[PDB]
Amino acid sequence: SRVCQVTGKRPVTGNNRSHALNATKRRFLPNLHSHRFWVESEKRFVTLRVSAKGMRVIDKKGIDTVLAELRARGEKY
Amino acid sequence: MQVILLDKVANLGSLGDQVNVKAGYARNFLVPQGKAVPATKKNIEFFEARRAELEAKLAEVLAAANARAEKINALETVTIASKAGDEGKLFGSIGTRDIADAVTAAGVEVAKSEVRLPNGVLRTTGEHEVSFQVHSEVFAKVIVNVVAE
RNA sequence: AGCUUGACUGCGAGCGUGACGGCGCGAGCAGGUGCGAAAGCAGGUCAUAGUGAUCCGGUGGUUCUGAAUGGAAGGGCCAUC
RNA sequence: UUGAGCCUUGAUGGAAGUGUGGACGCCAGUCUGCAUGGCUUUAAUGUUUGAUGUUCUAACGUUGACCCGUAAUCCGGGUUGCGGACAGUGUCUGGUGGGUAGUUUGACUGGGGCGGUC
RNA sequence: GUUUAUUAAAAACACAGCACUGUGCAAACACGAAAGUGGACGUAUACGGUGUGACGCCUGCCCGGUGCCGGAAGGUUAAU
RNA sequence: UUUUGUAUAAUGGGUCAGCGACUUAUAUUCUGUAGCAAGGUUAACCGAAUAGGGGAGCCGAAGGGAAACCGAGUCUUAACUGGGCGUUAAGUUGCAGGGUAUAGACCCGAAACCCGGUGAUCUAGCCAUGGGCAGGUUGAAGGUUGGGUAACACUAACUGGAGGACCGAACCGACUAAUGUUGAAAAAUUAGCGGAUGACUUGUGGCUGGGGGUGAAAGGCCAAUCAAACCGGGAGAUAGCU
RNA sequence: AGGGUGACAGCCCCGUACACAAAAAUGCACAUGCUGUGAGCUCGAUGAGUAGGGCGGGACACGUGGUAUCCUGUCUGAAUA
RNA sequence: UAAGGUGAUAUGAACCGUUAUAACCGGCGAUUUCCGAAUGGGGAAACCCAGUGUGUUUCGACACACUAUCAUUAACUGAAUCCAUAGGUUAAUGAGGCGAACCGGGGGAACUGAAACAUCUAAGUACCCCGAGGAAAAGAAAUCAACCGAGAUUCCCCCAG
Numbered sequence A: 001s002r003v004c005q006v007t008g009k010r011p012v013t014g015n016n017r018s019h020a021l022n023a024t025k026r027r028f029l030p031n032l033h034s035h036r037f038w039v040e041s042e043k044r045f046v047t048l049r050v051s052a053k054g055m056r057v058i059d060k061k062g063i064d065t066v067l068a069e070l071r072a073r074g075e076k077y
Numbered sequence B: 001m002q003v004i005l006l007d008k009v010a011n012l013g014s015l016g017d018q019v020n021v022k023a024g025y026a027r028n029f030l031v032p033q034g035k036a037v038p039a040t041k042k043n044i045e046f047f048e049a050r051r052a053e054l055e056a057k058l059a060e061v062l063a064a065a066n067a068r069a070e071k072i073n074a075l076e077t078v079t080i081a082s083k084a085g086d087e088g089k090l091f092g093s094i095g096t097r098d099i100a101d102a103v104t105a106a107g108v109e110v111a112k113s114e115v116r117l118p119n120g121v122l123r124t125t126g127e128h129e130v131s132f133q134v135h136s137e138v139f140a141k142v143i144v145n146v147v148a149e
Numbered sequence C: 001a002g003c004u005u006g007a008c009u010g011c012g013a014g015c016g017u018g019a020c021g022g023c024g025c026g027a028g029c030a031g032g033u034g035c036g037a038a039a040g041c042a043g044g045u046c047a048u049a050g051u052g053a054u055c056c057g058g059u060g061g062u063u064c065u066g067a068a069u070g071g072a073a074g075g076g077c078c079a080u081c
Numbered sequence D: 001u002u003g004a005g006c007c008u009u010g011a012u013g014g015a016a017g018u019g020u021g022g023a024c025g026c027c028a029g030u031c032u033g034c035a036u037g038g039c040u041u042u043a044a045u046g047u048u049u050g051a052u053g054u055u056c057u058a059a060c061g062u063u064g065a066c067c068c069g070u071a072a073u074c075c076g077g078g079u080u081g082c083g084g085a086c087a088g089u090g091u092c093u094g095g096u097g098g099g100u101a102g103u104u105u106g107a108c109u110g111g112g113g114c115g116g117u118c
Numbered sequence E: 001g002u003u004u005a006u007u008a009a010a011a012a013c014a015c016a017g018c019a020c021u022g023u024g025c026a027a028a029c030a031c032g033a034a035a036g037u038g039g040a041c042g043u044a045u046a047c048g049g050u051g052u053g054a055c056g057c058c059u060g061c062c063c064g065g066u067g068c069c070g071g072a073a074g075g076u077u078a079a080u
Numbered sequence F: 001u002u003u004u005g006u007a008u009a010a011u012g013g014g015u016c017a018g019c020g021a022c023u024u025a026u027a028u029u030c031u032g033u034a035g036c037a038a039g040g041u042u043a044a045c046c047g048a049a050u051a052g053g054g055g056a057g058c059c060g061a062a063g064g065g066a067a068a069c070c071g072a073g074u075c076u077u078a079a080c081u082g083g084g085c086g087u088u089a090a091g092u093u094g095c096a097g098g099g100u101a102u103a104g105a106c107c108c109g110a111a112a113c114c115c116g117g118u119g120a121u122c123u124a125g126c127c128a129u130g131g132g133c134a135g136g137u138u139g140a141a142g143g144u145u146g147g148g149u150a151a152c153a154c155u156a157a158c159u160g161g162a163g164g165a166c167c168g169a170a171c172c173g174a175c176u177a178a179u180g181u182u183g184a185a186a187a188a189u190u191a192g193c194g195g196a197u198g199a200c201u202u203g204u205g206g207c208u209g210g211g212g213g214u215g216a217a218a219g220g221c222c223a224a225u226c227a228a229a230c231c232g233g234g235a236g237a238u239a240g241c242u
Numbered sequence G: 001a002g003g004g005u006g007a008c009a010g011c012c013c014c015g016u017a018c019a020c021a022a023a024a025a026u027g028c029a030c031a032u033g034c035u036g037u038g039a040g041c042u043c044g045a046u047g048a049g050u051a052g053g054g055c056g057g058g059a060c061a062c063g064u065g066g067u068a069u070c071c072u073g074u075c076u077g078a079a080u081a
Numbered sequence H: 001u002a003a004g005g006u007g008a009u010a011u012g013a014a015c016c017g018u019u020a021u022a023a024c025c026g027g028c029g030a031u032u033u034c035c036g037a038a039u040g041g042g043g044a045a046a047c048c049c050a051g052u053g054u055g056u057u058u059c060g061a062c063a064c065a066c067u068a069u070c071a072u073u074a075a076c077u078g079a080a081u082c083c084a085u086a087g088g089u090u091a092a093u094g095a096g097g098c099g100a101a102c103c104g105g106g107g108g109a110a111c112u113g114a115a116a117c118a119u120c121u122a123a124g125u126a127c128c129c130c131g132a133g134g135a136a137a138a139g140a141a142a143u144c145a146a147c148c149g150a151g152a153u154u155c156c157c158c159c160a161g
């Protein structure tokens, strides 16, 4: 499931629109990446499948907090 | 990604300075490997409460015994001396424990030769006021009375 | 050949000719103009082909409009592409 | 290494003699430094800012080897080796693209087409 | 040898042989939004594509057009 | 019925009985009709429920101008001798009808497009595992021994047992004719015919699914149909045609 | 009201209007108990990878228009009564 | 509740009843083979085969119960790596499937209309998919209005084709 573990970001649907303005169904889908993060709080590499942005979020909120969610949401990690 | 520093660190480092580095270097090396930390604002005081409770706190906590020479601003009782010689002139020197002899009962008792004047120590009158090692900054003032016997 | 810009602007009794969109002829009125001593003539060319609706859009003019109010954008109106 | 800015120490805006590289030097100068002797036209650094190149490793790749979960040709964790900010993927973008898709491809006409016409 | 099972069995398809062209292996190619998998437990004396079509004697000229291959000057040229 | 025209040798109907096509909803206009009339009328809702309440609102009594605006006038233009559109005729709300609009809009009828399912019990190709090929010929390589060479070469007997090899039943196919063609049979029977140790043939089970498969390639085959299967749905597709 | 009864029934039968009924299990109301549960005052605090923005699409009756408002795949990114 | 009864085609038989345990109706219980989510493993549904506990003056054997997966919790265990995570057994709870419509969300056609057709339409329809309730969803203003004011959401009639 192309789904960002931290932001929820899943793929969406849209049209293409040519010059002719012709609709063709299509997908935008997240820039995911699954990165190995260090925790220190757990002496371990928890390795989430994140979207950049998802990344930028960790970079702000902090991993202990992002992993705080998920834990609190049900998710594995 | 600004982040504040822990250890030194090449082209930015400074044990706590305010850097602004590329995000990767940080979340890929600097942090998670102990060396820096997100400048989480919570922190810019957490690591600025030091730049004040220290560089302006413990740099003032030093000043509590000014010059160390406080009420000793009127010299000290001359118990004995520091010696003499050359039938009129001077001859003898200060053993690695012989500048106390006179001021030998004032402050706290010690016995070491933290020499300050790397000269042949001038041999004349007697009483002199240089400085001696009282600390890495301040000084002190007393005199030296000889002994006639 | 001389002088010229009537190849004018607003209108228009009344007719033609079209299923219609439209096209055409028109004396006369007002303003203002050219030629003529004057009567007068001139709203292109002897007439009849020489063309392309609507939309969208451009450009000038014009406060007519203009979403709280004042402006402005955009819209209208006239001119033109 | 390199294009350009700023900060600077040397150029345009403790004497005289016995001595040296670079030079628009008004065409023939004098210099700019080299030894001594009782705000704007110029060179190097500290740098700030981009370009280019080496290498590094720490993202990331491993369809090499090993350890464990595990009597397992999956997976995951770990170790090690090779590689490496490349490759790849997301968004955006120019090109190619009958492979696929939706369609168009007029009327008159002594049948239709052709010709011709509108 | 194959073929239109039910109007065509052939001169059509296939064929061994030949050539051209792709592919250095996580191959190209192919099924598949992926994961996985065929190629292949193969590795250029192999594997795909295309055409020709045992064998004998042979296989000339043409690169303008179309297609394909290569080109680190310039002209033109997208997001930004 | 269709036609310029049909006894027409042009359509349709064997015959009877039953069924079988211009409807309904909401708007909207006109006529008829009824009420009230410079007015008419209420919607939802309330409700003492076909009453009554509710006048929100709708239409009409005023037009002109793109409009600001002016107003029985107004616009045109500086202004019109004028010109255009207006002032001079009552409306409105039910009820029935005639039209129109939106809906399947008078009834039946395509070939098709799209979605989601069911099918490799026929058939193509492949995978696994099993079975089958009477009888009769030809006689490769190799081997042995002789003769042969200086030695090889060569050569004769014999031995041997190859082959998408030959003839021919089983088995697999399907070239010709006749019969049949409301058949014995929705593709056969009969007499002849090709293959028949191979790229053979066959049983059981498996895999491939529809713009897909599979195809020694015919657009062949995919359950008596395939230039895109079958079932169900969109669906009363659309039908300026009959 | 309606139905049945050998043809059409107020008065034959079942019904009907009306008036009554549950040992049990349940529904809903309340009045209580149990477990909770928090109430009121004062003093605070007041929702950032967010709003906004570039790109691409999609929603708004509005088909990028002169196009505000909303959602977000991608890249970014404030103020703090 | 009762003087009649043992459902039907469908009689007949052998019976049960008549003042309260005939029958009939209703509340609460018991029983409820096998298959089916089907759940001990398997499987061509209604069949094959188990493991562990039990259990028999005939304790061979054969009857009875328990053993699916997943999630939260807990106890006990426990790698690479020594702590620790991972893993492992066990236990208690829960889920699972079915079924009308309405409802919220994920995805999303085409014929057709435009008298061809591509923007546009059909239509966010059909259809697939997930989730839930008696309803759902929405909801108490960073909403409107317009210099006066209003004061959440939902639904109806108007505004207005």
Ligand SMILES: [Mg+2]
Residues within 6 Å of the ligand: none
């Ligand atoms: Mg095509």
Ligand SMILES: [Mg+2]
Residues within 6 Å of the ligand: none
């Ligand atoms: Mg024609």
Ligand SMILES: [Mg+2]
Residues within 6 Å of the ligand: none
């Ligand atoms: Mg043959």
Ligand SMILES: [Mg+2]
Residues within 6 Å of the ligand: E004
């Ligand atoms: Mg045939």
Ligand SMILES: [Mg+2]
Residues within 6 Å of the ligand: none
């Ligand atoms: Mg034949």
Ligand SMILES: [Mg+2]
Residues within 6 Å of the ligand: none
């Ligand atoms: Mg080949």
Ligand SMILES: [Mg+2]
Residues within 6 Å of the ligand: none
């Ligand atoms: Mg050929």
Ligand SMILES: [Mg+2]
Residues within 6 Å of the ligand: none
């Ligand atoms: Mg005829």
Ligand SMILES: [Mg+2]
Residues within 6 Å of the ligand: none
């Ligand atoms: Mg006749």
Ligand SMILES: [Mg+2]
Residues within 6 Å of the ligand: none
């Ligand atoms: Mg007839």
Ligand SMILES: [Mg+2]
Residues within 6 Å of the ligand: none
């Ligand atoms: Mg088979």
Ligand SMILES: [Mg+2]
Residues within 6 Å of the ligand: F165
């Ligand atoms: Mg043979």
Ligand SMILES: [Mg+2]
Residues within 6 Å of the ligand: none
């Ligand atoms: Mg035969």
Ligand SMILES: [Mg+2]
Residues within 6 Å of the ligand: F168, F196
């Ligand atoms: Mg034969």
Ligand SMILES: [Mg+2]
Residues within 6 Å of the ligand: none
């Ligand atoms: Mg053909």
Ligand SMILES: [Mg+2]
Residues within 6 Å of the ligand: F225
């Ligand atoms: Mg068939």
